[PDB]
Amino acid sequence: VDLGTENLYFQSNAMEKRYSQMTPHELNTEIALLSEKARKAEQHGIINELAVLERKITMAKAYLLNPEDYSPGETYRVENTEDEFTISYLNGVFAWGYRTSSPQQEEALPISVLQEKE
Ligand SMILES: [Cl-]
């Protein structure tokens, strides 16, 4: 068993544990540092790395938000897409629900990507 293929499960859990204990100021500092590294990756076209950093930023941003500001049963726009996502329930910093374009698939998205409808 090459459990190393699951490297990101352990990295992800460590990140979430770390962010869950941060103050808002610490999260803002983390996001600023990640954003500066992302800017550098973007300016050099290092796409893979830019994507890794942006996924971390999206997660850090979810820890700054308040899960109670999101409502089960409400439908939101998924940031940077033309999709709509209806929330089934919240757990941690994620909203479990489904996209109106794939209503047979329950799935989870960080609350930071849910935008109130316009
Ligand atoms: Cl995180």
Curated annotation (Swiss-Prot):
Pfam families assigned to the protein according to its UniProt record, in alphabetical order: DUF1811
InterPro entries: YfhH, YfhH-like
Domain of life (superkingdom): Bacteria
UniProt-listed Gene3D superfamilies: Hypothetical protein YfhH domain, Hypothetical protein YfhH like domains
Subunit record text: Homodimer.
Protein name according to UniProt: Uncharacterized protein YfhH
Phylogenetic lineage: Bacteria, Bacillati, Bacillota, Bacilli, Bacillales
Protein encoded by which gene: yfhH
